Amino acid sequence: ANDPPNIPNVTGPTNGNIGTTYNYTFVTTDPNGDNITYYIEWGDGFTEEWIGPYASGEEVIFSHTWDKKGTYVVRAKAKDILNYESSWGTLEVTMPK
Ligand SMILES: [Ca+2]
Question: Ligand 1 centre from 6 Cα, in Å?
Fold first, then answer.
């Protein structure tokens, strides 16, 4: 009967300056209204590993700083209390200088 969460959405700055801190907004819903945890990749090797639980539909804002030039693929997936996992939402963030 249980369904996995929907794929998370990630919004925030897609270009910035190396060393400056930026805020990213994450949110998804679970079809059953279940609480969920998020697994975030910042694209640079750092992660947030199943943070939460949070309410279904609650926007959660986390900041990050990249300290090397590059193009970083920020990704987020979610799983409900029964550990049924979503696919990944993604946002590409460029740090040119
Ligand atoms: Ca569910």
Answer: 9
- Would you tell me how many other CB atoms lie within 10 Å of the CB of residue 57? 12
Ligand 1 center to 57 CA (angstroms): 12
The structure's method of determination equals X-ray
In angstroms, this model's resolution equals 1.2
DSSP result, the chain: ---PPPPPEEES-SB--TT--EEEEEE---TT---EEEEEE-SSS-EEEEEEEE-TT--EEEEE---S-EEEEEEEEEEETT-PBP--EEEEEEE--
